[PDB]
Structure formats: structure tokens, C-alpha cells
Symmetry: D2
Subunit: 397 residues, 4 copies
Amino acid sequence: SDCRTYGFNTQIVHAGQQPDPSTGALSTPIFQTSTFVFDSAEQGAARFALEESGYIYTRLGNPTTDALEKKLAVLERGEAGLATASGISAITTTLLTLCQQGDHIVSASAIYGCTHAFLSHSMPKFGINVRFVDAGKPEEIRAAMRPETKVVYIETPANPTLSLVDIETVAGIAHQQGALLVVDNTFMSPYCQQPLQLGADIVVHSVTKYINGHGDVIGGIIVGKQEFIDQARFVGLKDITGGCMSPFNAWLTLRGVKTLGIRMERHCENALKIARFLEGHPSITRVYYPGLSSHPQYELGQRQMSLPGGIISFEIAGGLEAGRRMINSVELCLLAVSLGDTETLIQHPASMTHSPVAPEERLKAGITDGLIRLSVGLEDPEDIINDLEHAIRKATF
Amino acid sequence: SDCRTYGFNTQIVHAGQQPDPSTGALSTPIFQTSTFVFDSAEQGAARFALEESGYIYTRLGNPTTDALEKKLAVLERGEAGLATASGISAITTTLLTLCQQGDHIVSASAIYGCTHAFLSHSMPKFGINVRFVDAGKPEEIRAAMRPETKVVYIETPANPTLSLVDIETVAGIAHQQGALLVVDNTFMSPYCQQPLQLGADIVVHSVTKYINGHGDVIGGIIVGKQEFIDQARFVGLKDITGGCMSPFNAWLTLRGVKTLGIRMERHCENALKIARFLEGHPSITRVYYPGLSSHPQYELGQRQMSLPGGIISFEIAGGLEAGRRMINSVELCLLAVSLGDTETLIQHPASMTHSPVAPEERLKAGITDGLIRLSVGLEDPEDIINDLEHAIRKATF
Amino acid sequence: SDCRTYGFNTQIVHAGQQPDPSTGALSTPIFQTSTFVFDSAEQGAARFALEESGYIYTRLGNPTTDALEKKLAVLERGEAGLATASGISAITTTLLTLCQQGDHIVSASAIYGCTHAFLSHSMPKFGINVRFVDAGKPEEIRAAMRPETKVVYIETPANPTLSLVDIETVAGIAHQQGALLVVDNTFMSPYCQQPLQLGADIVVHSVTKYINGHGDVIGGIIVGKQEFIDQARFVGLKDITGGCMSPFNAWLTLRGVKTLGIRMERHCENALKIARFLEGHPSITRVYYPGLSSHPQYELGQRQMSLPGGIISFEIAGGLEAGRRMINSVELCLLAVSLGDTETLIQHPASMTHSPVAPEERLKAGITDGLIRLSVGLEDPEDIINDLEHAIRKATF
Amino acid sequence: SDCRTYGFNTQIVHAGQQPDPSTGALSTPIFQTSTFVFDSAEQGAARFALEESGYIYTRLGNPTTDALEKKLAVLERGEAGLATASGISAITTTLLTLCQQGDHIVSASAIYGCTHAFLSHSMPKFGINVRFVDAGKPEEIRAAMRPETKVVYIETPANPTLSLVDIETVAGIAHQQGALLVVDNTFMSPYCQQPLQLGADIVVHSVTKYINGHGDVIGGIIVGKQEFIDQARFVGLKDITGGCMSPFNAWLTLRGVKTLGIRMERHCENALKIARFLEGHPSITRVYYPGLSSHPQYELGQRQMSLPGGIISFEIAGGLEAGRRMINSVELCLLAVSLGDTETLIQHPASMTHSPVAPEERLKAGITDGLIRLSVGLEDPEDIINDLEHAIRKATF
């Protein structure tokens, strides 16, 4: 039977994977090889000019990595997947495959910082200009389009304060103007959002976060039409970034994603409990979490995502000093820059990852002095709340 | 004591590595993590604005990968190393870090095909033009330089027929014109050639070949000045290609390189025996191997490399059909596109990896119909010669 | 704070693990080493006569494997843990550590077949005799005890038909007679049952099943008093079986167990749905599942386990031929001998794993001709039920 | 063609390995699985009663581990191989498979300490008695034989001072009395000694040392007749020790052994240079190294081994205090208990690993106060000699 016919949890577990044909090994073998041998010169000829359209494997189409690419293609309802060395490489491989000197991109502003740096500094040095807009306002996207515009690029929910972007509406705008829509689905993952089903042409993830979920792989994935993915593979990866994923990283991500459904359900149930606790706490001025009724785009999130995700941002009373105290007083949450792990991770951007960026530039970038971002893990939510309550109380008494 | 003071085999084994400080583990631990935790907000602040200048680790400076980068910096006598997802990513990360729209590159013609494709097709689409020259003639390099020329790029020995490039001379030319020299040292490796010691500014490898040597890692490494490597890391990798090496791939390459000295000695001793056998064989029209006295640049190879390498190319009598017969009649050598493995690998480019490319374009590219490339492995050389003798005899009777 | 104070899900995620002290790496490093180096002869002297009572690491106390042993000690509420090469090695290392020529063991009959073979054939050849009893009847255990009896050994739920053993009662019997109680907790795992909290002295698992849960590790773990575990480590493992777990297998099991809580909840919710479907199906004569009200020991299971587990056994109408037809007609469930994986696995013991064992001996051993055992995975339960309904219908029409 | 026909280096590289049939992957895939699936109930029936005599794989006959077992069977010229969790498990699995209550073993005295402990303490508690003899005197072996004697067990070279055992002679003695000869070949490895070719029935190794050679695997291997290995697998491993090797450890050992020939050649060339230096040094009273003409059994070593190995033992002037000073003054050699690594490792047994064992018992056991054991690695031998010269000079001035 066909992977695409099963329910979503069944696809999470099975899609792209079968017992090994030669051995019956249930786990996908780790094909940790750099080379593939041919049985004759004919085979060498055919299936190295053919470009992987029988079943012939190559280091750009490793059997292990193939399984992961097919899985994620199924979960996202795209035709084909392409794994990469990092979430950044998924984004740059995509964009550098699509764009040449003289092209233009319209991008959301409220995006992952390293993406913002690639788009603001790197792209224009290759002759590709980018306009940044507030993608929460689809009209700003339309107004930025140019005859040169090849692609519109968005993240949702948006990186710091988890404001949302209306994918369906933006896809319509981009397509009417003949651009592709590229959506970074990292923070939702397949489970919570499916951009392609909403009109996006290409979805990218950092698997580093939820898809792997175990805090032990850096990796990225791109999903879209075969025609695009073929180019992203045989030109973008092969020729431009060289950002191939190692078969071991693919194997671990395959293993991590087996639990995607139940981890996302746990992260989301936990985050909701925690968000409600924070919403009720007199030392917290604001809580940003799509799952709360006070979310300005609550209606959109309802239409567009199946769960409200495991990330919460919130502002502590007392600004910068309160933020540093709270962060230094947590005992269970771990201070880190990543997200989407099994452990609960916390960060204070204005206290840590943005100390150089003067008061003007960080607040502008959505980062207030009292802003804390919380990646909710799989611990007992009452342990996480107790830890937060203890740290907040210390920071604000 | 200092790694840089030991003999070369001692450096191969020890450089960049120490027993783990907390445990005494002799093997470098595999730090297969995506995230690093901070002990406080201060630490988060300092050592994430500081940019890894105490000992703080980050996913761009993973402890495992650090060890490999330091090892290869020592072996190449460079200041700093930077690992990458692939040999192609080492080359593109380097060049895209150095070059912007309006820049120019002078490159050798006789280089790895995927490098040639990145340079001929990808670079000009980002506004960076490339002139290809015969680098065996340092005068062609000088004549191609322009006011826009940022870097001269060479491979040696050159890819198909193992003609050589005079690094010292080319470095002088490039520097007099204010360009950097980038040398791809893949085929020699640290052990056989040290471009930086000859005036190159940056060396790149595919570790996929000899440095790893085990046919089970795709990876790349870049070595050069700290100032350059810092940019290649914190801008090229972080912002442009995202071509990070996974800590497991770094660990395996660390383990592979432990035997670099004795594998290179074995490959080179074996290849010399095999090259001499082929040179004496009436069905072989030509043998290309720097270790033979009939090599046109024999004197240069003597000055520039400590051993003549493990790759041999040779032409079989009877052109295309003889090539396909020989290749189909080998029983021990394996048909494959890679090189630098423990096993002996053979390929017929005109029979396999170049079937589309009409008779005009392949011969031009140094590939004759009867050209066979042999990566000599660690088997008994008489077994390899017996296998070759048997296949040649079949192909040419 | 102390791992032992957190809620159980928090312990699953955190117990035995901390960010790496030297690097802040969040994932436990894989210490894939065979050797540990000393800083001086004094250190060599002390901490190799001391026997690992500071923090000194050794190949029997690998840092990675230590983390897994401590985790499982916490989850089981034992003092100390000891990992091993396999679930069988956890059982034999334990028993061979405790027992010498002239000793006796009382064992449950309804246990894992390879355990039964070690106990029935191997133990008596070393002078250690074993009496097998129906442990569902604690009186049979008491009646088998002898002055030589060192240990009572039970599995629960019992292997084929998931009948239960009253741990608390049996522990009391064993201790009154001065024997230790060893419980194999494989099928429940920490999450569903905690034998030590019920009076067992030692718990063993095959981590191959639920604790790892990903179908890609063979491994075992033993938990008990430090005094016992010290002997099981420094004598049983070091001297007798040599059944050390590799640090990589420990790392993967650590990673697998992070999701134990949410996998057990999913397996158990799924199995209950499936068990209810099977209980309502006219082609299924019997369903064995502790979670059904018709379980003869329903009351005991209520007292003794927090969830009713993910394994179901059931009998199909039409005996042997119906069993083979059903098994050959499933399309999503996979035919396999293991259990406790993310995928749903099915087996027909009388059709497969017991074809030699004549009709007399298998039925006696609780295996009827129509008995099917189902390991329920993480797929959508309606997909599993649809698959079963389809196969049953084919097998019984 | 047949693996068994090639030269030895060719066998090292190729034996037991082929490109993956389904993919052409050159590296043996890591089959890191616990479970194997069947295609039907028939297959389940046949090839789980059949016991792995078609090509059916099982966790006791993992495809990866199979490759390693076949390789080592070829290198040792035995019929079949069996991998295990540790070198100790190779020895105990073997002996516990062969021996039952009332049996007897004649064993060499000068053997690995943990082997000595298993034989002296563990075996007699299972009703199996052991007589220890000086195996350098084959007459002591004959004189210890009894009607109960099932197996003679030897190591050579012998553990501390590298005295030799005449395998051919001892095999003849054992067989005339109807016992099996088991030889621990760890210190020589396939490359330097082949006991089966000399009349031994079974060879065991710790692969932890030379066969793996990289200081990152603990593992063992047993080679002998199919009939024996079948029992050691399906009874010893499956039923008794459970000491299965993980497929990843097998994969790494496969990768390590690819370089066995060239590592052994390097270790042996280095050790000879170092041994000659030590033999000429006035602060070293004695040097034990089979490669020196002053070795009492020099003639035997000539007949019995192809190279004299990479281990050296030697006595420093000034006894215990000189030993501790020397060891504390080395800067390149690493203090460790293992051997057979790429790095040079040094130990002072009387200073470290034998501090409890009073002056009477250690000297008796061949360990003098001034005895140092050196595992010579792959560094430049002049760096190792310089390091030794520096440490000796400090220790003895």
C-alpha cells in the first residue's frame, strides 16, 4: 500500500521507510559510505548520466538520506524532499538555486537572525536584492514586489513574539505576481502546519529543532516539486553550497522523527499549561503564545495550525535586570540558544545573544529588555511551572 | 609540549587531540549535540558576543570538529582549520567568502568537474567571472589576471592525467598581483604536499578521499590564516553555504587520519609498483604517474611533493571498447567514481561518467577514449597487478 | 537540585544527565573509547585500586553508560544501575553473580524462551538447579523453595498471555525464606511498573524493547543495591559474561528513553483501543490484555501497574491455518520476533518461532495454534485496526 | 573469486566484505537494528527453525557483524568467526560453551589478569577446575592433564614479559590427550601469528587492541570450526553470556582492521627501533622484546611469528621509585592500561595497576618493581625514543 494513504501518525512512523530488502532489517541501515560501486561500465554509464531515476544511489541520494527525504515529502504533502547540512543550508541552497544576479526577494522581517543576515548582507553582494517587510501585513508583501521578484520568503510563527503569517493569502499574492512562496516551517513542523497544502511552493526546515527533536543533530530539509528539488540537489547542493547531510545525521533524524506526533502533542499540551500559568502571573507583563485567546491573530492560528506549538515568549516585569535574574535563578530549564529539544530551554535575548546590538536596534527587532523565550520540553509541566515560578519570584521580589 | 614541534607522523596521530580533561577518555568524545548550554546569562552574553576566543564551544566550533580542524591546521602548517559538509563546500565556502559581484577568479582548467561547474556556471550568475587557464603554464595564469582578480585557484596534481602545477611560482604571480592563491590539495594530502609552505594562502581538501581514507565520509576542510578562517566560519558557513560538518563525520575523519602516514606510504609504494608494471605492458599506450621518470614534470614533482601519490591514470590500447572490456573484466578492483579509499577503485571516464559529453568535449577536457583512472588501495600490489594483467589481456587480445 | 525529587517525566528526560562540564554540550557526549588515560602514576594507583568511587571512569564505568545506568536507577528507584550487551546478559550476569554450584533458583515458567533455556539447560550444567513454577500462584513459589534457594525469578506480565505475578506477595515469600527476588520488568518498563518499590531486590530489563523503544539497540540493564551492582559490575561483567554495553548503544538508549513517558502513554492508549476492537470481533475467540475488564487478574494489575502496557495477545478462530493466513494478509503490521518498537509488530508463535516443538510441547507452554502476539506501535490506532480487521476477515471468511 | 585465495593484505582489506547488493554502497552498511522482519509466516517458520543456513539474518548474525566474523575467519584460516561484547566475553563464551561442572582446564599462568581471575575464581564456583602452569614449558602442560581435561588455554606472547609459548607443540600434547587448544592471539593478531595453522582449535582475541587498533572499541572475536562456532553462537552467546557485539562496534572494528597490515608493520618497525634504543641504554637493566636477539626463545619466535609485535616491556634501574618518576616524566607517551592503540601507551604495573597486591604476589606474577610496559604507536619512533630518553634520564639521574 501507499504511504500517502495512511493517517498522519502512521506516516510519521512508516513513510519513506521499509524493512531492508536484502536482510529484513527493520531499522533503516546507516549507509555511511562516500562511494557507490557499479556492476559494469554500462551501469556506470547509464545510471551516472541517468541521474537517479531508476533506483541507483549516489552520495546526493544516499539510501538512508533518501528515506528521510521521502518521509518529509509525505508529511509535508510535497513531491520530493532534499536533506541538507543545516537549516541555514536548506534556506541558502533553495534561494541560491532560484535566484541570480539582478533578482529580487521579498522577505518577512521577523525571521531567524542568521537568515536575516544571509538576506541582508550576503544576497546583495551576489547581485540579489531583498526587501524586508512585516509579513503579518500581506499588503506590505504585495507593495514590495517588483518585476525582478522571484520569491517571497516567510517564517511562521514569526521568530521572537510568535506573530503569525497568513500563508494562503501570501501564496495568492506571490503567485499572482509570478513569484514562488518559500515558507520556513521549522517552529511548527509537519505536525502543526502544512504550508504546501496552503499554497506555498517550497517548505524548508531546520530539522535541528522539532523534526529531529533530540538536540543532537544539525540539519535541514527542503520539500517541494520534483522539478525544483532536482535542481536544488543536482545544482544547488552539488554545485553551490555542497551542504549534503551525512547519512548518520539522516539516520538520527529518521529516528527522532518517529516520535514527532507524540512529542508535538507533549510539547503543545505542556506549553499551553505553562502559557496559562504565565498569563495569570502578576510579574509577567505579556505572554506571546498562539494557544492563548488573547493572541491578536488567534483566528488565523485556528485556521492554519492544528496545534499552537511548544515555543512561548514572555516579558518579565523589571526589564533587563529582571530578565538576567530570572535566567540565573532557574534550576531545571537550561540556558541555551536552540529550541525544539526534549529538555526545556530558556533564553534571554537582550541579556545574552544581543548584548552588542545597542538599545535601539534590538527593541526595533522585536526584542524588549524583559523578553524571555521558552522552548517547552517533555518534563512534567508542574516541574517546569515550579521552576519558572521560583525564578520569576526571585527576579521580581 | 607543542604539537607543532613533533615529527609529522607524531602530528598525524596527536595534533589537535588530547585525552578528555574531565574523564581521561583517550578517543576524542563524539560531541553529537546541536546545542550548548550556558551556566548563567553573563556567560551567555560574553561568550556569544565574544565569538569563541576563550574556549567556549558552539555548533560552528564543536569540540570534536575543533580537534579535526586543529589537526589539519598543524599538518598543513596553517594557522586555523575549518571543516565542512563536503569537499565542494570547502571550495565554495572559501570562494563565496572571498568573492562578491564584480570580482574575478583565475582558475586552473584541469580541475575536479564539479568545481569546474561551480566556477563556469554558478559563479558568473552571482556576478563573479572566472577565467580558466592551463595552470601547468604559469604564464597563462599571469596573462589572465585582471584588476578585479581576487583569487587564483589551482589543483595539483591536475585531475585526469596528473600533470603538476608549480605552486611556489604561481603563488608569487598571484601575490605580485595582490590575489590570494587557493590550492586544492585533495589528491596529495598533507603527507605528500604542503601548499602553504610553498606560498599558497589557503588550502582546501575533500577529506572524502585520503584524509579520511576509509570511503565512508563525505567532508571537506579549509586551512589558512585565522583572519580568513574566522570569516569563512562566522560568515561563509554561518551565513552563506551552511556547510557544517557533523561531529560524527569529524570523529570518523579524525579516526581515519590517524593512519594517514602509513596509508599514504602504502598507497604510494603500491602505485609505484603498479605504474611500473603498466609502463612495461605492451597493451598500455601511456601511463600518467608523477613517480615515473617519464613524467614531463618529474623535476617539479621532486621539489614539490614528498611522495608521488596513490592515483594512476593510463591509456589502454584499443580506445573506448577496450576500456569498457577491461573495466568489465576486473575482478578485484571496484568500479566507482571516488578515489583515496583503502580498496582499489577503477573508472573509465569515457565509458561511464562522461557518456553524454560528445567526442569533442571529453577529449578536449583531457579525457581520451582509452583513459582509465586507478585509485590504488592497500591490497597486495601483486594481487592488483594480477587483476589488471588479467583484465588488460582480456580487453586487448 | 536532586534528580530523585522531580516528577517522573522530568526524571525520564533529566535523570543521570547534565550538560557536559567542560563544553556545555547538551547531549551526553558519546565516549566511544576503550581506554582512559591517567595524569600521573599516583592517579593510576589510587583510582585503579579505588575502583571508581571518586569520579574516575573506566570501561566498566564509561561516562555515557554511567548516565544511562543512573537514569534507570532513578526511574526504578534503585541505588545503582548496570548496562549490559543484551537483556539476556542482564539476566545471566545477575544470576551468575549471585549463584554458585549447589545453589537453587525458583523461577516462573511463563518467561522469555531464552531465559527458560538458560535456566533449564545452562544453569544445571554449572551445578545450579532451577525449579519452574506457575508464579501466578505464589503458593507454588513458596512450595519450591529449598535451603539452597538463593533467588526467586519472575517476569510480569508473563510472556505469552500476559497473566500477572503479584510482586509484593512473592517478594515477601522470598525474603521470609532469605532469597532475593529478581524481576524482569522488560514488558512494563519503569513507566508502568516499579518492582523495587514493591519489594523486589533486583530488576532487569531488555532495553531492546521499550526503554530504548526504537528497534535499533540490543542491550540490557540491571538495577539494585550498590552492593549488589558493584559485584555484578566488578565480578559478573568483568570476570564472568564480559557483557559490557558499548557507549554508542548506551547513547542511543539514553536518546530512546527520553521519549519513554510519551511512547508508553501512546502504546497503551493504542493497545487499549485495539484490544477493545479485538474483544468485540466475532472471529477472535480470546483477547489477553491486562487493560480489559475480563482479565482474570484485573484487580492485581490495577494495584501493581500504572498502565496496562502495549502488548496484546489474542486467539484467532480457526487455529493454525487461520493464524498463518491472518499473518500473511497484514499490510501495515510487520512480522517480527521483537516487541516494544515504534512500529506495530505481529507474530504467530505456532506458525513461526515454534514449528519444531510438536503439538504437545507448544500448547503446554501457553502457545495455542491460533495465538497471535501484537506489539502495538505509534501509528494511528484506526490504521492498525483497519489492517487487523482486513487480515482477520481474510483469514476467517 | 574467493577471499581465501588472495594475499594477506588483500584479505585484510576485502575478506568478508562486498559492496552492498541492493545499493552498491562500498562501505558495509551499519545494520544498527534489533529486529529483522519476515516476508510471510513461512519465512518466519523456515528461517527461524533453520538457524541461519540460507542467508537469513538474525541479531546473533547481523549483516555488519557477519562481515567482521567472516573477515577474521579468513585472516585466521578458521571456518567461522563469532564477535562478542569484549575480549573477556570471547574467552568466557568459548570456555563456558565447552565446559561443564566436573570438567578441567589446563591454563597458562602468564595470562591477562582478568582471564586469570575468571579461571581462578569464577570457573571453580561452577564446578570447573583449572590448573595453572608455566606454558613456556610444554611438559608442565602435559603433566597437568587429567581425564576430565577438556581444554588447554594459552596466551602468546605471554602477558607481562613476552615470553613465548610453542603452539604447535602444545596443540600436539592437548590433542593426544583429547583436549582442545584455545589460544589467545590478541597481542599478535592475525597478521603476526596464526595459531589455527599451528594446530590450535580455537583462537580468541580482544579486538579492543590491534584488530580494531583505534582505542575506541571494546570487543572480542572467536574463530574456529563451524560446529564449535555454531554452539558458541546459538548456545554460549544466546543462552549463557549474552555477549553480543553491537553492529556499530562491528562496523568500527571492520573499519579499524582495514589498516591492520600497515599498522602492524608500523608498530613492529617502531618497537624494534625503540627496543634497540632501550637495549643500549645504561639505565635499563632488561628489555623484553621478541625481536631482540637476546630473547631466550628467539628461535621459536622466528618459527612461529612473522613479526615480533608492537609491545615492549622493560625494567628501569632503581625499581619502584624510578618507575613512578619515569612514568610521571613522560610527555608524549600516555599513561593507560590498554594496548594496541595508534598512540604510544605506557604503564607501570607495580606503580599503578597492582598497588594492593603486596611485594610477594606481584613479583611472583612476573611483575618487578621496575617493570614498565610500552605499547608502541604510530608516532615517529625518534619522538618516542626522545620522550623515553628524557623520562628515563630524569628518573635515573
